[PDB]
Design an enzyme around this catalytic site. Structure first.
Site, PDB file in Angstrom:
ATOM      1  CB  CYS A  84      -2.954  11.776   1.209  1.00 37.58           C
ATOM      2  SG  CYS A  84      -1.993  13.066   1.740  1.00 37.58           S
ATOM      3  NE  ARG A 111      -6.886  12.812   1.577  1.00 35.35           N
ATOM      4  CZ  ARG A 111      -8.354  13.019   1.523  1.00 35.35           C
ATOM      5  NH1 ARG A 111      -8.846  13.492   0.259  1.00 35.35           N
ATOM      6  NH2 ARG A 111      -8.518  11.605   2.358  1.00 35.35           N
ATOM      7  CD1 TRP A 160       6.090  16.822   7.051  1.00 37.86           C
ATOM      8  CD2 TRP A 160       6.033  18.392   5.399  1.00 37.86           C
ATOM      9  NE1 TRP A 160       4.439  17.521   7.664  1.00 37.86           N
ATOM     10  CE2 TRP A 160       4.876  19.442   6.300  1.00 37.86           C
ATOM     11  CE3 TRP A 160       6.360  19.213   4.093  1.00 37.86           C
ATOM     12  CZ2 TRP A 160       4.393  20.045   5.858  1.00 37.86           C
ATOM     13  CZ3 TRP A 160       5.013  20.562   4.036  1.00 37.86           C
ATOM     14  CH2 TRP A 160       4.200  21.261   5.122  1.00 37.86           C
ATOM     15  CD  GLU A 218       4.401   8.770   5.624  1.00 39.77           C
ATOM     16  OE1 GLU A 218       5.099   7.739   4.142  1.00 39.77           O
ATOM     17  OE2 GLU A 218       4.473   9.559   5.903  1.00 39.77           O
TER      18      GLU A 218
HETATM   19  C1  HEM Z   1       3.210  17.488   2.952  1.00 37.21           C
HETATM   20  C2  HEM Z   1       2.988  16.635   3.854  1.00 37.21           C
HETATM   21  C3  HEM Z   1       2.229  15.769   3.678  1.00 37.21           C
HETATM   22  C4  HEM Z   1       2.615  14.073   4.821  1.00 37.21           C
HETATM   23  C5  HEM Z   1       2.502  14.499   6.396  1.00 37.21           C
HETATM   24  C6  HEM Z   1       1.574  13.152   3.940  1.00 37.21           C
HETATM   25  C7  HEM Z   1       1.039  11.871   4.505  1.00 37.21           C
HETATM   26  C8  HEM Z   1       0.385  11.103   3.906  1.00 37.21           C
HETATM   27  C9  HEM Z   1       0.841   9.153   4.529  1.00 37.21           C
HETATM   28  C10 HEM Z   1       1.300   8.993   5.951  1.00 37.21           C
HETATM   29  C11 HEM Z   1       0.430   8.912   3.297  1.00 37.21           C
HETATM   30  C12 HEM Z   1       0.562   6.975   3.204  1.00 37.21           C
HETATM   31  C13 HEM Z   1       1.718   6.532   2.339  1.00 37.21           C
HETATM   32  C14 HEM Z   1       1.677   5.336   3.283  1.00 37.21           C
HETATM   33  O1  HEM Z   1       1.200   4.847   4.033  1.00 37.21           O
HETATM   34  O2  HEM Z   1       2.422   4.284   2.571  1.00 37.21           O
HETATM   35  C15 HEM Z   1       0.306  10.081   1.606  1.00 37.21           C
HETATM   36  C16 HEM Z   1       0.007   8.839   0.835  1.00 37.21           C
HETATM   37  C17 HEM Z   1      -0.200   9.778  -0.021  1.00 37.21           C
HETATM   38  N1  HEM Z   1       0.036  10.968  -0.585  1.00 37.21           N
HETATM   39 FE1  HEM Z   1       0.367  12.596   0.601  1.00 37.21          FE
HETATM   40  N2  HEM Z   1       1.757  13.065   2.322  1.00 37.21           N
HETATM   41  C18 HEM Z   1       1.942  15.081   1.885  1.00 37.21           C
HETATM   42  C19 HEM Z   1       1.806  15.373   0.672  1.00 37.21           C
HETATM   43  C20 HEM Z   1       1.670  14.921  -0.029  1.00 37.21           C
HETATM   44  C21 HEM Z   1       2.092  15.561  -1.486  1.00 37.21           C
HETATM   45  C22 HEM Z   1       2.706  16.862  -1.756  1.00 37.21           C
HETATM   46  C23 HEM Z   1       1.128  14.717  -2.220  1.00 37.21           C
HETATM   47  C24 HEM Z   1       1.560  14.779  -3.758  1.00 37.21           C
HETATM   48  C25 HEM Z   1       1.395  16.220  -4.553  1.00 37.21           C
HETATM   49  C26 HEM Z   1       0.801  13.593  -1.679  1.00 37.21           C
HETATM   50  C27 HEM Z   1      -0.297  12.943  -2.111  1.00 37.21           C
HETATM   51  C28 HEM Z   1      -0.066  11.802  -2.095  1.00 37.21           C
HETATM   52  C29 HEM Z   1      -1.001  10.326  -2.226  1.00 37.21           C
HETATM   53  C30 HEM Z   1      -1.590  10.447  -3.757  1.00 37.21           C
HETATM   54  C31 HEM Z   1      -1.349   9.179  -1.324  1.00 37.21           C
HETATM   55  C32 HEM Z   1      -1.246   8.363  -1.468  1.00 37.21           C
HETATM   56  C33 HEM Z   1      -0.642   6.762  -2.222  1.00 37.21           C
HETATM   57  C34 HEM Z   1      -1.171   5.408  -2.113  1.00 37.21           C
HETATM   58  O3  HEM Z   1      -1.784   5.173  -2.434  1.00 37.21           O
HETATM   59  O4  HEM Z   1      -0.207   4.628  -1.830  1.00 37.21           O
HETATM   60  N3  HEM Z   1       0.837  14.112  -0.614  1.00 37.21           N
HETATM   61  N4  HEM Z   1       0.992  10.932   2.538  1.00 37.21           N
HETATM   62  N1  LIG Z   2       4.916  11.247   3.732  1.00 37.68           N
HETATM   63  C1  LIG Z   2       4.778  10.838   2.398  1.00 37.68           C
HETATM   64  N2  LIG Z   2       4.265   9.304   2.389  1.00 37.68           N
HETATM   65  C2  LIG Z   2       4.130   8.725   0.867  1.00 37.68           C
HETATM   66  C3  LIG Z   2       2.867   9.336  -0.060  1.00 37.68           C
HETATM   67  C4  LIG Z   2       2.637   8.155  -0.877  1.00 37.68           C
HETATM   68  C5  LIG Z   2       3.336   7.621  -0.777  1.00 37.68           C
HETATM   69  C6  LIG Z   2       4.481   6.929  -0.176  1.00 37.68           C
HETATM   70  C7  LIG Z   2       5.389   5.270  -0.147  1.00 37.68           C
HETATM   71  N3  LIG Z   2       3.526   4.348  -0.451  1.00 37.68           N
HETATM   72  C8  LIG Z   2       4.860   2.703  -0.611  1.00 37.68           C
HETATM   73  C9  LIG Z   2       3.520   1.859  -0.230  1.00 37.68           C
HETATM   74  C10 LIG Z   2       3.722   0.330  -0.133  1.00 37.68           C
HETATM   75  C11 LIG Z   2       4.668   0.161   1.017  1.00 37.68           C
HETATM   76  C12 LIG Z   2       5.420  -1.011   1.015  1.00 37.68           C
HETATM   77  C13 LIG Z   2       5.556  -2.139  -0.353  1.00 37.68           C
HETATM   78  C14 LIG Z   2       5.907  -3.128   0.349  1.00 37.68           C
HETATM   79  C15 LIG Z   2       6.366  -3.817  -1.214  1.00 37.68           C
HETATM   80  C16 LIG Z   2       6.626  -5.419  -1.055  1.00 37.68           C
HETATM   81  C17 LIG Z   2       7.297  -5.944   0.078  1.00 37.68           C
HETATM   82  C18 LIG Z   2       7.858  -4.637   1.539  1.00 37.68           C
HETATM   83  C19 LIG Z   2       6.427  -3.419   1.234  1.00 37.68           C
HETATM   84  C20 LIG Z   2       5.051  -1.527  -1.125  1.00 37.68           C
HETATM   85  C21 LIG Z   2       4.386   0.057  -1.058  1.00 37.68           C
HETATM   86  C22 LIG Z   2       3.645   0.414  -2.613  1.00 37.68           C
HETATM   87  N4  LIG Z   2       2.474  -0.949  -3.091  1.00 37.68           N
HETATM   88  C23 LIG Z   2       4.550   7.642   1.484  1.00 37.68           C
HETATM   89  C24 LIG Z   2       4.758  11.467   0.897  1.00 37.68           C
HETATM   90  C25 LIG Z   2       5.152  11.237  -0.084  1.00 37.68           C
HETATM   91  C26 LIG Z   2       5.309  11.993  -0.932  1.00 37.68           C
HETATM   92  C27 LIG Z   2       4.059  13.312  -0.043  1.00 37.68           C
HETATM   93  O1  LIG Z   2       4.494  12.686   1.080  1.00 37.68           O
HETATM   94 CL   LIG Z   3       8.103   4.946   2.900  1.00 41.86          CL
END
Ligand code: HEM
Ligand SMILES: N=C(Nc1cccc(CNCCc2ccc(-c3ccccc3)cc2CN)c1)c1ccco1
Ligand SMILES: [Cl-]
Ligand code: HEM
Ligand SMILES: N=C(Nc1cccc(CNCCc2ccc(-c3ccccc3)cc2CN)c1)c1ccco1
Ligand SMILES: C[C@H](O)[C@H](O)[C@H]1CNc2nc(N)[nH]c(=O)c2N1
Ligand SMILES: C[C@H](O)[C@H](O)[C@H]1CNc2nc(N)[nH]c(=O)c2N1
Ligand SMILES: [Cl-]
Ligand SMILES: [Gd]
Ligand SMILES: [Gd]
Ligand SMILES: [Zn+2]
Lengths: 402, 405
Positions: A106, A109, A278, A283
């Protein structure tokens, strides 16, 4: 020892002493690094519960206090009586924020201390789960002034099925498999789309059809729930100077609300704990719209920009990608929906690393995920060495419930 | 078992069985990953085991495993190590080993080319002046008037009783970095230390941004000796942009030949501390890292302002737009100068082919994702979506301590 961690832009050196407290093993060994891979008993529970309670009481400067000792005895007595225990609400809030804080992938953070925690541990039905989810979406969306939030549904417990949200996010666009094997809509969601159709959803045939939710109460089949369209804030994409961009009909939704991760606090497991913040614009503009296995619109936009698309060295891909990211940022700002560009987000993450070095002696961070998917080395995180490790409380991947 | 490796764009899955043959430890442990660190690390029976493994690799590569020649070479090496403490590579083995070291280099995206490498055997070199001769001939061959040819010149191996041959410079062509009184740098900040060493060893410095440094060449047990490269040997490319006409007035240039000269080549337990190698540039090395890194030439904001971009807010993506146009300028300028260069799209596409080739040939390919993924437009390239396994195979190019520290 403690890993020495260098920032190559500034030359500054830190040591990550926090990594020495890493709970679980990651995938790497001295023989080979797997850092780029996407997917890497009362005694055990009591051990994790005690470590978490100690963590919590240390954080509030009450280590060794009477309240600390009393809480440890309460947890021991509950595990002995029931095989499990219940978090106080203050501990749940702390645990959710820590799990976010501990999330190595993330970049957002810097915000970790600002999290609205909705306690849905009294939830009993999929219908009530839906009500909690709608209240979450309404709160977090806040007419575009997005607020980070998590709703925590009842914990896992022996002899009872889990609450699960089958959808990977609360807002997902349908992906429809075509007769020739291609996809209309979001290829990431073909599987959940077909599951929705199997469970009685009448599919659309658009590129951006918002999916219904499949909500699973313990030991029941998932139930289908339509999100009221007024709850799902969406942003039509337009570009500040490319007037034809709006005609492409691209859109995305305001609220990234992730619903398929497991929240682990003190050895307790919450398989349904959707969290939202957000978006960072890459993304949407880079991954969701330009990935070849997602909407894959890059060449369409390049055609509209009159770019030369059959020499790579014109960098037409890079130019088209930038303008799509520009369109995302412009469009969310125009719509008054919170969004952060990858420069601002990575700069704030550097501030976060600095805060965490002072607060905890390090910060688990997954370089491959923190560095944005465009303009990597234009952002400060590219030049920052990072240490990746697993701390608890945590958000974990978990198997799909089907 | 073996690591399961997925390509997320295609959904294809492989198992990297080659990783099971990893010959040295990396910096990661199950407790924490250090994959993003630039510098992870830092006899007779051990030398023999590495030599035997290498000889076995060699004879397998030519499909002569188990031949009388294979057995004879094993016995000869074992006897030579017993009698002399070391051994000498045959010329064919040196060529194979240099190519294998390139093939094994996890941070090199250009490895589709690994079989095409001109190996100059300089193991008879006896002086710094002779090193300079070999280096000049290497530069001339490799540059080839801009039709660049990959090459390596292998100087004598490390041997007991004798100091090392070393090239102090990190590349054969480097621009001086002159530290100023206000802490700023004129020229290339990457080269401040070697610049000061050149001055300490008698070089009269320039005061330009693109002053080609002399070579500090060290023969065994001698202080380094200073050699100026004849300017006609150093092919350079003035940078212009095809549509941003003021860009040429920035006075930017870069050199044709990336010739890395400070890494140690290890083959079969033998160590070659001076073994400079050269190929050609990928355009992001110049246009993104060297020109746009904040701690390098750092030209991004000046280019963006001249492009009339709004630099007051980050969400205009002025950095991204300016960086793209700088990379365009590098590509355009090298092509105009008829100097070989590869853009990051073409390079990463070829690296995907290389991964495919190596899966079939060896069951895997050591790759460092953070280094393979280009520094701009990462997920626009196929390698971003490719999981990779990083591990150390030998023969290898390795980092080594600077010879003045
Ligand atoms: C507040 C603004 C936030 C921004 C801009 C942000 C941004 C991001 C981004 C860009 C990712 C990568 C997601 C991806 O590439 O699929 C990510 C991952 C993640 N975010 Fe944040 N996030 C925010 C808030 C949060 C919150 C509120 C939580 C949980 C309480 C959180 C928990 C996570 C976790 C657990 C991941 C890892 C997901 C994974 O391992 O697939 N985030 N975040
Ligand atoms: N800002 C935010 N964002 C964010 C944060 C955590 C996780 C994610 C979603 N992470 C998706 C990872 C992913 C991407 C593509 C595929 C996929 C799978 C099959 C075919 C094509 C694509 C699968 C996955 C999950 N393994 C977005 C956010 C969400 C909540 C707070 O902040
Ligand atoms: Cl997304
Ligand atoms: C033929 C065209 C080639 C291209 C386009 C190419 C491309 C690259 C690039 C872009 C890097 C990353 C460098 C950096 O970011 O600092 C790299 C690293 C590397 N290359 Fe290649 N390369 C080529 C040829 C060669 C040859 C001929 C050799 C050796 C015989 C070689 C060995 C290496 C090694 C050892 C590294 C790792 C350097 C390090 O770890 O610091 N490459 N290459
Ligand atoms: N195409 C090629 N390229 C290439 C390949 C291997 C290695 C390199 C050079 N690797 C540079 C790494 C580096 C970058 C910045 C700094 C630095 C240090 C202090 C301040 C500012 C910057 C230091 C280093 C060396 N650690 C280029 C090429 C060369 C030969 C064949 O193919
Ligand atoms: C194979 C590789 O790990 C994969 O494509 C990763 C790379 N970095 C990422 N970074 C983020 N933020 N999100 C991702 O999905 C990925 N995917
Ligand atoms: C800290 C981080 O490892 C460092 O900035 C790396 C990242 N990836 C890289 N990739 C390449 N090709 N070259 C580099 O110098 C680096 N630097
Ligand atoms: Cl370079
Ligand atoms: Gd047109
Ligand atoms: Gd112009
Ligand atoms: Zn690792």
């Amino acid at each position: 020892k403690f890993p020495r961690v260098k920032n190559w832009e500034v030359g500054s050196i830190t040591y990550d002493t926090l990594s020495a407290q890493a709970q679980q093993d990651g995938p790497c060994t001295p023989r080979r690094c797997l850092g780029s891979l996407v997917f890497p008993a009362p005694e055990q529970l009591l051990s994790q519960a005690r470590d978490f309670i100690n963590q919590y009481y240390s954080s509030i400067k009450r280590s060794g206090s009477q309240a600390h000792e009393q809480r440890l005895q309460e947890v021991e007595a509950e595990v002995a009586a029931t095989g499990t225990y219940q978090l106080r609400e203050s501990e749940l809030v702390f645990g959710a924020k820590q799990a976010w804080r501990n999330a190595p992938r993330c970049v957002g953070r810097i915000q970790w201390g600002k999290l609205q925690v909705f306690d849905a541990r009294d939830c009993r039905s999929a219908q009530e789960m839906f009500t909690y989810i709608c209240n979450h979406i309404k709160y977090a969306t806040n007419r575009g002034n997005l607020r980070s939030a998590i709703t925590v549904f009842p914990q896992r417990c022996p002899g009872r099925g889990d609450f699960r949200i089958w959808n990977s996010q609360l807002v997902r666009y349908a992906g429809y498999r075509q007769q020739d094997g291609s996809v209309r809509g979001d290829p990431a969601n073909v599987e959940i789309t077909e599951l929705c159709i199997q469970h009685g959803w009448t599919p659309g045939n658009g590129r951006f059809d918002v999916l219904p939710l499949l909500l699973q109460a313990p030991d029941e089949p998932p139930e289908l729930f339509l999100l009221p369209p007024e709850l799902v804030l969406e942003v039509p994409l337009e570009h500040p100077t490319l007037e034809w961009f709006a005609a492409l009909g691209l859109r995305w939704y305001a609220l990234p609300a992730v619903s398929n991760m497991l929240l682990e606090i003190g050895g307790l497991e919450f398989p349904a704990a959707p969290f939202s913040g957000w978006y960072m614009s890459t993304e949407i503009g880079t991954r969701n719209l330009c990935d070849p296995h997602r909407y894959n619109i890059l060449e369409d936009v390049a055609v509209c920009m009159d770019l030369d698309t059959r020499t790579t060295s014109s960098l037409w891909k890079d130019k088209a990608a930038v303008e799509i990211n520009v369109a995302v940022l412009h469009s969310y700002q125009l719509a008054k929906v919170t969004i952060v560009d990858h420069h601002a987000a990575t700069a704030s993450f550097m501030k976060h690393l600095e805060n965490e070095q002072k607060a905890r002696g390090g910060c688990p961070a997954d370089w491959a995920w923190i560095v944005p998917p465009i303009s990597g080395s234009l952002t400060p995180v590219f030049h920052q060495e990072m240490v990746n490790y697993f701390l608890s409380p945590a958000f974990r991947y978990q198997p799909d419930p089907w």
